[PDB]
């Protein structure tokens, strides 16, 4: 069933230790969507975003 298949596709990602990560979280409707800009990654490298 779907319940018995939950440890099937969860290949270790379900039991990793949970750490916080700073990210800007907005709310659209009922979901939370996290917004981020990784352009400072590219401007250090002088690579076109």
């Amino acid at each position: 069933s779907t319940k018995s298949d939950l440890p099937a596709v969860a290949a270790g990602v379900e039991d990793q230790p949970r750490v916080p990560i700073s990210a800007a979280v907005i709310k659209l409707g009922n979901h939370a969507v996290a917004v981020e800009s990784l352009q400072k990654m590219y401007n250090d490298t002088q690579s076109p975003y």
Binding site: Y42, D44, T45, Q46, S47
Partner: protein, 49 residues
């Protein structure tokens, strides 16, 4: 840093810059005219009020 290219366009070489920065050595100079007839009583010892 630079991004390691994924395609074989060009080899993603390392980058280090040797930049030389020349300093700004500034000279500031005022004047303070001080009259010698005050210097004469500077050198003299006083005894009367």
């Amino acid at each position: 840093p630079t991004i390691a290219h994924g395609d074989g366009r060009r080899p993603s070489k390392q980058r280090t810059f040797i930049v030389v920065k020349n300093c700004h050595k500034h000279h500031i100079s005022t004047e303070m005219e001080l009259s010698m007839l005050d210097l004469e009583i500077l050198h003299s010892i006083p005894e009367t009020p």
